[PDB]
Amino acid sequence: GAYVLDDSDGLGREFDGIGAVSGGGATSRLLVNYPEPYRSEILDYLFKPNFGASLHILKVEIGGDGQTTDGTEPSHMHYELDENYFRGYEWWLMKEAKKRNPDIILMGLPWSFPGWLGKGFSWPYVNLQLTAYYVVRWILGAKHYHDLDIDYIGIWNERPFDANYIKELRKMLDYQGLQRVRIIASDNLWEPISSSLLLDQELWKVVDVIGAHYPGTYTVWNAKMSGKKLWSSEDFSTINSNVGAGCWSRILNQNYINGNMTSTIAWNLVASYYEELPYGRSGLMTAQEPWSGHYVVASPIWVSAHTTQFTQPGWYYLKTVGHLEKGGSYVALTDGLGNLTIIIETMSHQHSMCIRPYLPYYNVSHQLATFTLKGSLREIQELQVWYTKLGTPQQRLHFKQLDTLWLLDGSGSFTLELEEDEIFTLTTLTTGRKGSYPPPPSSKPFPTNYKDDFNVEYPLFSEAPNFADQTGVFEYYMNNEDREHRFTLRQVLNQRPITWAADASSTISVIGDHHWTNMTVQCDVYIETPRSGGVFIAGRVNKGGILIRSATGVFFWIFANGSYRVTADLGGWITYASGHADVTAKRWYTLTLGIKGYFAFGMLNGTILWKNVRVKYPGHGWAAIGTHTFEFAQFDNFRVEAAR
Amino acid sequence: GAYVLDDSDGLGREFDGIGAVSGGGATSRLLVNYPEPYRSEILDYLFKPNFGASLHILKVEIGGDGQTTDGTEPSHMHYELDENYFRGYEWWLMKEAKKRNPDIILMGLPWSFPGWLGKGFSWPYVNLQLTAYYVVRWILGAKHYHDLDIDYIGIWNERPFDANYIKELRKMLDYQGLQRVRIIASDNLWEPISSSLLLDQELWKVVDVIGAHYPGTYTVWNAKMSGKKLWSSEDFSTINSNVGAGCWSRILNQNYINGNMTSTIAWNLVASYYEELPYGRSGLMTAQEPWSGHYVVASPIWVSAHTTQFTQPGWYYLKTVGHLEKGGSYVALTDGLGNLTIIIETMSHQHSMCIRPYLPYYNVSHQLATFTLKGSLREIQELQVWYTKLGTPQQRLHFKQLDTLWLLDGSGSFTLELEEDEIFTLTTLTTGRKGSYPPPPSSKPFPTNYKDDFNVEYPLFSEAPNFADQTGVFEYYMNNEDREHRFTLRQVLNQRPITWAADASSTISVIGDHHWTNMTVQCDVYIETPRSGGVFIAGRVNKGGILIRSATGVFFWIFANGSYRVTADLGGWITYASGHADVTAKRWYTLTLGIKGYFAFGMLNGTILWKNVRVKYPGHGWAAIGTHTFEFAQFDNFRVEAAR
Amino acid sequence: SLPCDICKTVVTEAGNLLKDNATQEEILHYLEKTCEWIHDSSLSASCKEVVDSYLPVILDMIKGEMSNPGEVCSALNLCQ
Amino acid sequence: SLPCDICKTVVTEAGNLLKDNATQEEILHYLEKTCEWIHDSSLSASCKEVVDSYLPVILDMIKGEMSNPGEVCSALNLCQ
Ligand SMILES: *[C@@H]1O[C@H](CO)[C@@H](O[C@@H]2O[C@H](CO)[C@@H](O[C@@H]3O[C@H](CO)[C@@H](O)[C@H](O)[C@@H]3O)[C@H](O)[C@H]2NC(C)=O)[C@H](O)[C@H]1NC(C)=O
Ligand SMILES: *[C@@H]1O[C@H](CO)[C@@H](O[C@@H]2O[C@H](CO)[C@@H](O[C@@H]3O[C@H](CO)[C@@H](O)[C@H](O)[C@@H]3O)[C@H](O)[C@H]2NC(C)=O)[C@H](O)[C@H]1NC(C)=O
Ligand SMILES: *[C@@H]1O[C@H](CO)[C@@H](O[C@@H]2O[C@H](CO)[C@@H](O)[C@H](O)[C@H]2NC(C)=O)[C@H](O)[C@H]1NC(C)=O
Ligand SMILES: *[C@@H]1O[C@H](CO)[C@@H](O[C@@H]2O[C@H](CO)[C@@H](O)[C@H](O)[C@H]2NC(C)=O)[C@H](O)[C@H]1NC(C)=O
Ligand SMILES: *[C@@H]1O[C@H](CO)[C@@H](O[C@@H]2O[C@H](CO)[C@@H](O)[C@H](O)[C@H]2NC(C)=O)[C@H](O)[C@H]1NC(C)=O
Ligand SMILES: *[C@@H]1O[C@H](CO)[C@@H](O[C@@H]2O[C@H](CO)[C@@H](O)[C@H](O)[C@H]2NC(C)=O)[C@H](O)[C@H]1NC(C)=O
Ligand SMILES: *[C@@H]1O[C@H](CO)[C@@H](O)[C@H](O)[C@H]1NC(C)=O
Ligand SMILES: *[C@@H]1O[C@H](CO)[C@@H](O)[C@H](O)[C@H]1NC(C)=O
Ligand SMILES: [Ca+2]
Ligand SMILES: [Ca+2]
């Protein structure tokens, strides 16, 4: 089997880059509170050129206050007339990425929207101009407050598009001097966007890129025909084991070979969210322990390097790419300056299955491949070699540089012995590097004794560390008018968002160790809504993210009508205990909840309210705080002591 | 506590009887081919008075050719001009039940309907008259051909009702001289039937009984208010273990106590369908091995006896019924001829959970219950006692008669010592009997070497034994015009019926042992449709019933266009092998399919067509036959040899 | 009055669409194919099973409401 | 002509009805409730989880088709 590589008949499509997603939702949540130098080391493995994953693209969620997979992300406009360009962690992340790689490509995309944009409906297309103004404000803010140039803007993540909205968005962007910003649509399937572009000349003109999710390396006829750039704008979403690394390796090559896709973007960037939340450990690497500093440079990081360190957006694929006789594939790219990169993969079916979609069986066996460099490639005498072998610990080798290959015999030809689950990068480039930092601290569970008094005058981030909001939005709050409770944590949503997921009907933020079973939670609470207001503290909270509605545990609620209730569920369908209590609005109370084995008790201002209440056992989960509906409330002097 | 029982202030509601369902779907399939005396013994345990379950009601499915849970059931009208009142096994079952108990109550209800009836639509209410004539004809057929009086008629099982169809049905029945036949509606939830009856005087007049499914012992306000009889027209559906028996025990009492329900009907009568099909072993007893004669007189049989042997439709409940101080309940009934029956249950929450709906925790602890007989019940001085204890085999006493109680002290009072999971029947009746037959043969797997040449000239039943149709309908067929293939099996559906379940798009009948993994299937096949026709033989078929669409195995197909295909799925989405073959319509071919480990082969007329084709392994399932669509085809000389 | 007559005719047509023979099979095939997109090699059964277990009941339930056009229009405030 | 104008307004009323704020939560509650009827103590989680996962996507997808009333009417043979 001889495979010809040649540029004599011209070139293939322009390569657009490899990237990853931060968001959809709160995937980078636990990264922000990592101690130095570890936080900066992690960022280097992700973004530093000629080091680690050396990513070309960073795609971020434009927070809309709704639950978007592993938590909620704060919006720049919680209410109409509200504007704040310093909430959350996406601004910080984009700036950190840009510091390491100034040529990084930036993309923004909404999953949810604040409820006020709906004007009575849970729909973002009620006023096209208004929704476009909300999105464009985010782009302008990125530039004005953070010196960030957003390169691409999306429509509505995995949700219907409105052709008129897309057109209106283009008009709005141009009007605000953002003609350079490009539009990608529709961050869903190939259809109906592809056919819509063929039937509407005006829509065709305003859409720059067709972005499809989890395509399984293939495209559709209408998309090829559109003549637009085709990107796998969301892919991967698999556990970062060797299997996850194989999946990533295979699709990186075959998305172009099989589907003419010139960019692939992984969900997600780094697993910095509690592993027990949906799709745990599905990032290119792992960083879910800010309390310990422990992080894992997972296999997908090196699979990324095989392409990212040896290609750049603007290079061109050759016309000569394809599959191997006995399984696997090869791609080849040039920069038009005489450089050449060759990427070969032999991922076995059993060690490269992604979550989406279904992968049909294919055989891979030992083989030999001969490559011949025709055209201007013949003039190349030398190639650098990089190698990776995925599998068992006895046989895993990552991004190891091998002996240089020479083609001095004028033949312009070479041969390789290929086995299964291997990656080879053959490049003229000398800049390759397997980046290294000393090993980080060992893994350790979440602290068994933890407290946060929220007494931070000028916080770096909008929310206290380790609190992962699952419905509603919680923020640092300063109340000067009170000396006893000057610095608190406040739930700030006053209405349900235009939801992406099925958010709970009560707000909730989870924290700690999901393994915890016996625990004591304490918090000072303050109900802002007279008569109707309510708050809670909870333990053994077992579900979150897109499943937040399903959460069970032990919930201790107090209400401003002088009542209390103890429930088994966040939904409050199952009552453990209930009664009266001396509770009103606009008054500070200390709540204590103790859970041990089959029994629980609750305290109000250090006095027993209820005791020896039988609860389900065994049971385990996080500690939590929240409010009865989307209402204002404050929390202070949070404490938890637990046994795993 | 002292529990009073009295008839001085009058009586409660009239008791209507305890019953079971045969159908929805093919639940009695494997009973018909049991050898004697076992078949007759099973029937006695079910229907013989003062013996076993001694059932008051038998509810049957009116076959509509569609898949209705564990298979398809044949209709009396496959086509508009087709009428046959001798297909299937429901006629036979009703006659067998009636022979044992002439006072048994008979009910009929459609799940599916044949296609033709819809007149181009998948809706039964297209022509209200044609649908009513189709149904009423069955009821008349039941009398004219089998001398059976159908007492009750339903609408459409767990599907929407049409008030105008319900009105047409009454008219139709009356017009055909069936004024005695009563209507039960709507075999779904309490609503919208209950409120519809309150808003429509005309509908109220034509509906005799409100029949609800899996009510969880409760009714609704509108149903109580209607003044109609309320029945749990479908309940139970739980594995016939001690847990299943507890569920049945508890609901039998509490459906009346909590929901004013005067009848409870269990799905299903007897588990005579492959256990690996949906809801396996969910009958009052088990009879799933006609090849061995092995049957199991399960616990629910004796739980039934506690009521059925000591009550009869027409008896009245007393006003004095209720719950016990430390958990459990008691009901009491009279015939108004001096007889009295008292049924007590103490089913623990953990040992009485049904499949539907959700059962909330309740405690059951040891207690003493004193019973005093006021009114005309005070004249009673002698009561017979029957006892049951459900649990582990060590503490397992079914329907054991205890020492006779004497209330000679004029007090008209007695006390009982009550533990958990116990049933007591206290009756004046002397007729009680724990029926007994010698133990049936031991359980044995389906024969490893099996053949059926279908050479039955005048079969007793419409289909060959052990073939369980999962899509389409297969019947014995005689073709005199051919001597080599005079007696065959034929798929007779030529169109998709008005489906209750999600039937496959190809017809299929499964047979054998679901545990089989290595097997050789052989069958002579005959394609009736020119050009477009297709048939198959299969092995390792894993799923059936309601999930027949998802079924996977090794399917060997041959089409009248001169082609073949080997698939991993019934849907044919996954191809193992494909190619050309010397195959046409209206010609007999012998198909052989061999499956062993990772490899399979196929033969056409003893000649290899394909060999060493790699298949998924491990894998296990039944053998099967079928057709590409709803089309005519014939099968002959069926053979299977397998290893479990 | 007059929009009441037209409203009733629209509901009728929409009903007749879901009532078409082809409709059930066409929906199952769409939904089973989306199952291959939603999940991998192992969990392709769960998804497909859920679809073949509830789709009939859901579709037939909707056909039930489309069968009373007067009632639909009354809720849409085009009849009463 | 005239039934095309009425048809379009019917699709809009229904479309706006599903688009009401209260609609999502209402549907969630209904299906989450029916999950207690369909399954017992153990399997009440599976049903509820499936509901909270796919209803969002399904409901919002329908709201999309209702958003083009002309297209709906064209398929209903009241417009073209
Ligand atoms: C969380 O709290 C529960 C409640 O106390 C803990 O469970 C209890 O653990 C103790 C000690 O491990 C068990 O006691 C032992 O009982 C056996 C006889 O059953 C006896 O031989 C021993 O000497 C000792 O007394 C107790 O049974 C157990 N209770 C239950 C209901 O399981 C649990 O261990 C705590 N978990 C954590 C992680 O802290
Ligand atoms: C169904 O057929 C398959 C295919 O033959 C059977 O599996 C095979 O069983 C044999 C004997 O049990 C296995 O061979 C053994 O291999 C080991 C080394 O691995 C060797 O030490 C032994 O002396 C012997 O040669 C064979 O590996 C196995 N094949 C596979 C793929 O599992 C299976 O047992 C049959 N099942 C039934 C119920 O009949
Ligand atoms: C999209 O990619 C496909 C390949 O997946 C291209 O189709 C052909 O690919 C073979 C090799 O697999 C080449 O020999 C052919 O020359 C390709 N066709 C053509 C017309 O060049 C397909 O061309 C690509 N489409 C676009 C729009 O570039
Ligand atoms: C391969 O790519 C490198 C990287 O761009 C090229 O090197 C650059 O060459 C340009 C002129 O062609 C100079 O202005 C840059 O300063 C060079 N940069 C570096 C880091 O070397 C190189 O020309 C390409 N071709 C070969 C054969 O190496
Ligand atoms: C339906 O059954 C309920 C009980 O489930 C009856 O309601 C009352 O039940 C208590 C005992 O549980 C008695 O003390 C009351 O006297 C009952 N009410 C009446 C009006 O007698 C209810 O009566 C029954 N409904 C019908 C229509 O008979
Ligand atoms: C209890 O029920 C039995 C069964 O019906 C009654 O016995 C019947 O009594 C009638 C007259 O009342 C006779 O015509 C039947 O021949 C009797 N049948 C049998 C089998 O005994 C009995 O009267 C009822 N009362 C008591 C106190 O036993
Ligand atoms: C894979 O290919 C090799 C070589 O062609 C062969 O030996 C092996 O049996 C094949 N495996 C499968 C499962 O097809
Ligand atoms: C059940 O009741 C008994 C007696 O009142 C008591 O000892 C036991 O603890 C109770 N169990 C539960 C789980 O409530
Ligand atoms: Ca504070
Ligand atoms: Ca024969």
Side-chain angles (χ1 to χ4, degrees), chain A residues 333-349 351-373 375-378 380-393 395-450 452-473:
Chain A
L333 302 86
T334 177
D335 62 342
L337 302 173
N339 287 288
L340 165 63
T341 302
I342 305 167
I343 309 160
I344 309 167
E345 61 83 24
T346 52
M347 296 306 130
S348 75
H349 175 271
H351 299 155
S352 76
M353 312 228 278
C354 310
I355 303 205
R356 282 153 169 231
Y358 161 57
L359 177 73
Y361 179 76
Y362 65 95
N363 198 0
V364 184
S365 47
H366 155 63
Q367 58 177 326
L368 296 164
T370 308
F371 291 88
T372 297
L373 315 183
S376 304
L377 309 186
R378 181 70 87 92
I380 299 181
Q381 304 190 327
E382 186 199 7
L383 295 179
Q384 298 318 311
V385 187
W386 298 81
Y387 174 82
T388 297
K389 169 77 187 182
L390 301 180
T392 72
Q395 44 142 231
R396 45 166 59 192
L397 279 64
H398 309 326
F399 207 56
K400 259 101 173 169
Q401 186 171 17
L402 307 182
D403 300 286
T404 293
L405 189 122
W406 311 84
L407 327 154
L408 322 173
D409 74 328
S411 183
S413 178
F414 62 97
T415 310
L416 286 77
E417 205 175 306
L418 311 166
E419 290 185 44
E420 321 173 27
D421 303 342
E422 296 178 355
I423 310 166
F424 283 89
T425 302
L426 311 161
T427 177
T428 56
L429 312 168
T430 64
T431 58
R433 179 186 173 195
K434 174 163 181 175
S436 179
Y437 281 118
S442 67
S443 154
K444 298 165 190 69
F446 194 95
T448 58
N449 267 80
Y450 184 88
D452 200 341
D453 55 16
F454 317 113
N455 298 328
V456 184
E457 201 175 9
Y458 304 106
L460 298 175
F461 296 92
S462 70
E463 183 176 15
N466 307 312
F467 278 96
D469 308 346
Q470 301 302 321
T471 295
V473 166

Side-chain angles (χ1 to χ4, degrees), chain B residues 90-324 326-349 351-373 375-378 380-390:
Chain B
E90 306 303 347
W91 308 112
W92 168 83
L93 186 65
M94 289 193 284
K95 281 179 304 197
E96 290 301 323
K98 216 86 163 167
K99 273 196 284 211
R100 289 158 175 82
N101 180 14
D103 299 309
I104 201 181
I105 301 165
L106 301 176
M107 313 178 64
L109 171 69
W111 263 241
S112 61
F113 295 96
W116 62 263
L117 206 57
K119 294 289 169 173
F121 305 86
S122 196
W123 200 239
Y125 313 120
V126 168
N127 195 304
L128 290 186
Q129 247 174 323
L130 185 56
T131 310
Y133 198 68
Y134 160 95
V135 181
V136 173
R137 276 193 277 196
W138 181 89
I139 307 162
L140 295 155
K143 186 62 179 180
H144 284 128
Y145 292 100
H146 305 285
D147 192 47
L148 296 164
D149 297 318
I150 306 305
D151 305 290
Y152 292 86
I153 191 63
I155 309 308
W156 190 14
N157 186 71
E158 304 203 326
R159 292 294 178 274
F161 66 88
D162 192 315
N164 295 300
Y165 164 77
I166 303 182
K167 287 156 186 174
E168 211 20 73
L169 196 64
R170 181 72 276 169
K171 287 179 174 166
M172 183 56 85
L173 281 153
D174 296 340
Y175 187 73
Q176 295 299 324
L178 302 163
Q179 292 85 351
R180 69 164 304 279
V181 183
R182 305 168 146 120
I183 297 168
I184 176 172
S186 68
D187 274 283
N188 210 342
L189 299 178
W190 296 111
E191 297 290 5
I193 195 57
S194 298
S195 53
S196 297
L197 291 196
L198 300 180
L199 301 168
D200 185 346
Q201 186 189 342
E202 289 313 302
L203 191 65
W204 188 94
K205 290 172 191 175
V206 304
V207 180
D208 303 282
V209 176
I210 302 168
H213 290 189
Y214 306 93
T217 78
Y218 298 103
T219 192
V220 303
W221 195 77
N222 291 339
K224 302 183 194 171
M225 286 359 259
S226 76
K228 300 297 186 173
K229 280 174 182 291
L230 313 181
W231 292 8
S232 176
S233 57
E234 203 188 301
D235 226 326
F236 185 63
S237 185
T238 311
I239 305 171
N240 56 29
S241 73
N242 61 284
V243 173
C247 152
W248 185 230
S249 171
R250 182 181 45 81
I251 72 178
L252 280 169
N253 267 36
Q254 290 182 40
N255 278 345
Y256 180 69
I257 302 165
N258 305 346
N260 318 75
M261 286 170 270
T262 48
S263 179
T264 306
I265 308 168
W267 184 87
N268 57 71
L269 171 73
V270 52
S272 287
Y273 53 100
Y274 298 126
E275 207 179 355
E276 308 84 354
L277 286 168
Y279 305 97
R281 272 218 295 128
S282 300
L284 301 176
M285 63 175 290
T286 309
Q288 57 193 34
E289 291 184 15
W291 49 85
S292 77
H294 176 66
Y295 65 87
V296 175
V297 186
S299 316
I301 293 289
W302 304 115
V303 165
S304 306
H306 272 280
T307 305
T308 63
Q309 294 210 12
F310 308 114
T311 58
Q312 282 295 312
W315 278 48
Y316 280 77
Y317 277 103
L318 297 177
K319 289 206 182 192
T320 56
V321 304
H323 289 262
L324 296 169
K326 298 243 84 174
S329 70
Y330 66 92
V331 299
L333 288 104
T334 181
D335 57 353
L337 299 181
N339 291 297
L340 164 63
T341 302
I342 306 165
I343 309 159
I344 309 165
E345 62 82 24
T346 55
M347 297 306 130
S348 75
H349 175 271
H351 299 154
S352 76
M353 313 225 279
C354 309
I355 301 205
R356 299 150 175 254
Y358 166 99
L359 179 72
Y361 180 76
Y362 65 95
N363 197 2
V364 183
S365 37
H366 303 270
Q367 67 200 305
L368 295 162
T370 315
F371 286 87
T372 309
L373 315 183
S376 305
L377 297 176
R378 94 159 304 116
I380 306 168
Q381 7 186 32
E382 166 171 25
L383 282 164
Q384 299 318 308
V385 188
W386 298 81
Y387 176 81
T388 297
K389 173 84 180 206
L390 314 167

